[PDB]
Amino acid sequence: ASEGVLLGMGNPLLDISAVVDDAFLTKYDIKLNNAILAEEKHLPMYDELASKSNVEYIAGGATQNSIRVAQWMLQTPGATSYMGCIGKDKFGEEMKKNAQAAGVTAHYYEDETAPTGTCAVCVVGGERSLIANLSAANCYKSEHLKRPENWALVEKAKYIYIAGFFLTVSPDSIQLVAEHAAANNKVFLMNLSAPFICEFFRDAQEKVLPYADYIFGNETEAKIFAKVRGWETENIEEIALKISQLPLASGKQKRIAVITQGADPVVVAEDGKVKTFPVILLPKETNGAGDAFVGGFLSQLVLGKGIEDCVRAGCYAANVIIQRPGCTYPEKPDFN
Amino acid sequence: AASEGVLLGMGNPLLDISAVVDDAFLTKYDIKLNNAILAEEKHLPMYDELASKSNVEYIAGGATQNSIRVAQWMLQTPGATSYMGCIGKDKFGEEMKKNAQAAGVTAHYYEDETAPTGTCAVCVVGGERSLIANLSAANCYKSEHLKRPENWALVEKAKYIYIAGFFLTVSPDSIQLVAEHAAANNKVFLMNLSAPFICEFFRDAQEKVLPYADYIFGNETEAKIFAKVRGWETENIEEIALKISQLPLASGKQKRIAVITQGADPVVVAEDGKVKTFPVILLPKENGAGDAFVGGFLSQLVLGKGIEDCVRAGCYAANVIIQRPGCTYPEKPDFN
Ligand SMILES: Nc1ncnc2c1ncn2[C@@H]1O[C@H](COP(=O)(O)OP(=O)(O)CP(=O)(O)O)[C@@H](O)[C@H]1O
Ligand SMILES: Nc1ncnc2c1ncn2[C@@H]1O[C@H](COP(=O)(O)OP(=O)(O)CP(=O)(O)O)[C@@H](O)[C@H]1O
């Protein structure tokens, strides 16, 4: 677990989590077990959540959550890094404060006008309501990555994880680091989180797939990925195998596809074979479970462990996060 | 014979810089034909090279704006169409205003104070093309522009309002405001399934606007993905079109018409619980075909014509645009 051994790049959103009541949900007309794009009526909501003393600020975003969970799972200081776009405002300073507290060496790109991306995480029991305002998170430029103090994080990194969503924000950055990983013996990892499915983004994803050593995804993302490229099969075990056997780049030898199915087992394809991994629960046990699974998987991958340890750690971290308000965790882990 | 501003469009405007190119140009900038590539930044050496070419053509593009220009060209009545979208304060923004005025579209653009105007290089060789789109200011539209009286007057004047599904990612407030207004003031709100959604932020935003859609346009790929997202196991495009037309309707919305194109294969239309097939009829000795189909369909819909006339006009306009470099057309149409 060397300095900056694992790097992430994505859309950072400051998650403003707080336990709410019926009056709050009725006031802003927001329903539980739902995630909506933020509107004008939901913009003054971030001030009412701040006025609550029990508010929790977290440097969120799908990839950043995976990086924080990996840092928490590893515990070695300075092992993780992250790059993403934020705004020059109070929420941007809270993002920098929380990333430092989580142990992540974050080098953010500050946009000169777009305010920092935020996500209200309203909690009642186990249920949640997400209201994301992406705003600055979609303004990352490759000029930031190409600067020497930020490109040093790529050079230091052995494992680089980038979500498929980043292909819509900065396709130059993902392609540049994926090609660099193939040339300098680094492991490039990615996921099938491609919300937009246009010809522009399909061809952008087609160009980065050969450079992916690991492709993470969930049953819904994998089934849609299969239907897009004409694969008629619907069996998740067959789709995972077909993902692992996609064309490989010159600097690659094999690919591992990890498809989670929530409660159902985690499916892993490797060396032309598919293995099933039943989910093991914690003593007396969905928001951000996928992000926490990738985080736990990345931690054991960094330590040079076998696939079974990576799946068990992923499931452990996903089980911890779902029993907590948001993508939070205790001080130290209890995994083996 | 259509009234002033009877048809309005809202979207992501991009100045399409079209030009016929050769092998040396495609090799120089490493760009492939029949490929849609994103441009994180304007490649100035390429853009300036295109601007210095014989038969270089500037067009006020963008999927929705193309449909509006094709509808204006098909109608021929001056002042019948309107359009609102975000542009930058630069030379390409002035060329967008010049071409929209030439195309006969009353365009009221929102000028961003820093993001440069969205552009798209349309490198055409024979029948094939290569799109290199830099969205930039097109993704910066704010509902404050729509709510201004000189711009809201275009909504009030409009009987038919067409907005692409992709615009939900840019301004979901503007779509919800005009879709709910159309239901309250007996106006026809039309939309398409462009860039189908997989993330819950964008899926729930689309779920909120579907009841307000009187017409839903789409292609076989968009419709098949839309069906797989919401658990519809059927793959038959005729069954999918019927299921789209029978989605929940908003108060005071009696019916929905779903139009699913299949390229060469017939156009599928669902109406009053029945699906009708329309074979594509070609012109004597025969990208952007979908945009031109919607444009031709909108023109006859404005004139209060039957569905068969709308499909024939849509196919006529699509067949003209595909035998021209880009989404261009002759002075007057030949469809009666
Ligand atoms: N109901 C459940 N019970 C226990 N563990 C669960 C679970 N749902 C998910 N998990 C854990 O989370 C991991 C990832 O689950 P899943 O694939 O559903 O995530 P996701 O990111 O797609 C879901 P969401 O949309 O709820 O954020 C699983 O491999 C498992 O370890
Ligand atoms: N090969 C072909 N020959 C003739 N007409 C065609 C055609 N492909 C498309 N069209 C015309 O264009 C209309 C829309 O076609 P389609 O559904 O393929 O558009 P689209 O916008 O999805 C395609 P693209 O990705 O190429 O821009 C059809 O209804 C038909 O009138």
Residue numbers in the entry:
A (entry chain A): 3 to 287, 292 to 342
B (entry chain B): 2 to 287, 293 to 342
Lines quoted from the article behind this entry:
Adenosine undergoes ATP-dependent phosphorylation catalyzed by adenosine kinase (ADK). In plants, ADK also phosphorylates cytokinin ribosides, transport forms of the hormone. We discovered that maize and moss enzymes can form dimers upon increasing protein concentration, setting them apart from the monomeric human and protozoal ADKs. Structural and kinetic analyses revealed a catalytically inactive unique dimer.
Since the ATP site was accessible, we obtained a complex of ZmADK2 with AMP-PCP in the open conformation. The Ado moiety of ATP is surrounded by hydrophobic residues. Indeed, its ring is located between Ile328 and Ala295 on one side, and Ala265 with Gly264 on the other, forming multiple hydrophobic contacts. The O2' atom of the ribose moiety is bound directly to the SG atom of Cys321, and the O3' atom is H-bonded via a water molecule to the main chain oxygen atom of Gly264 and the nitrogen of Gln263. The α-phosphate group forms a hydrogen bond with the OG1 atom of Thr262. The β-phosphate group is H-bonded to Asn220, and both the β- and γ-phosphate groups interact with Glu223 via two water molecules. Finally, the negatively charged γ-phosphate moiety establishes an electrostatic interaction with the positively charged side chain of Arg130. AP5A in ZmADK3 and AMP-PCP in ZmADK2 adopt the same conformation and position in the ATP-binding site.
